């Protein structure tokens, strides 16, 4: 316990941004990515299913009000967020 | 003033991507967490169907704003989490 005071439009695996809001959380608003397509954009600008768009996830630190509905008392929490998309081969080498 | 009660690589996307990336160690002993693993794109370009680097396309890092604790105050920093492939800006 302590005291405390456009490029994605040009991607071959493009995404949209989605508002993730939670007043019981700091930061209250987190911008999450959702891939537009299951395939990737090929050279003619069409979705190609020989490759797949996949979201990249990241574990983010967050402050959660503890106990519920407290203006100045928080607990440190980790959550998983989608930060963007990449284009991958659908097969795995494992 | 508020009261606060107090790295791995588990996905294979980094290697399966047309914009693959490596991880670099970002360490700060007066910070929580002290170690963060940041992505860096492997190539300037992206991998084509033949397995070769296409220098016309661009590999670019995906950044995310994250919360860290510094010796105790709260700070927001930007971190690279992966890379995507984009078509370049080719007009004014
Ligand atoms: Cl410009 C382009 N070039 C290649 C690809 N995918 C193929 C590829 C990926 C990696 C390495 C080699 C080749 C896609 C696009 C592309 C992206 C976004 C919008 C587009 N709108 C119209 C036309 C193309 C678009
Ligand atoms: Cl399998 C493959 N297929 C297509 C691409 N990029 C072209 C493309 C992108 C988007 C839409 C259409 C076409 C790249 C790869 C590829 C990716 C990763 C490693 C590889 N290692 C060897 C050979 C290919 C590899």
UniProtKB/Swiss-Prot annotation, chain B:
GO annotation, biological process: adaptive immune response; apoptotic process; cell death; cell-cell signaling; cellular response to interleukin-1; defense response to fungus; defense response to Gram-negative bacterium; defense response to Gram-positive bacterium
Complete-protein stretch covered: 44 to 153 of 155
Entry's transmembrane regions: none
Result of altering residue 37 to V: Has no effect on the affinity for IL17RA
Stated family: Belongs to the IL-17 family.
GO MF entry, a single one: protein heterodimerization activity
The gene coding this protein: IL17A
Keywords: Adaptive immunity, Cytokine, Disulfide bond, Glycoprotein, Immunity, Inflammatory response, Innate immunity, Secreted, Signal
Name listed for the protein in its UniProt record: Interleukin-17A
């Amino acid at each position: 316990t302590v005291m405390v005071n456009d490029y994605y439009n040009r991607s071959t695996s493009p995404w949209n941004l989605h508002r993730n809001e939670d007043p019981e959380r700091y930061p209250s608003v987190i911008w999450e990515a959702k891939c537009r397509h299951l395939g990737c954009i090929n050279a003619d600008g069409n979705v190609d299913y020989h490759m797949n768009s996949v979201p990249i996830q990241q574990e983010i630190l967050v402050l959660r009000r503890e106990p519920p509905h407290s203006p100045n008392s928080f607990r440190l929490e980790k959550i998983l967020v989608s930060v963007g998309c990449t284009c991958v081969t659908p097969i795995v080498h494992h």
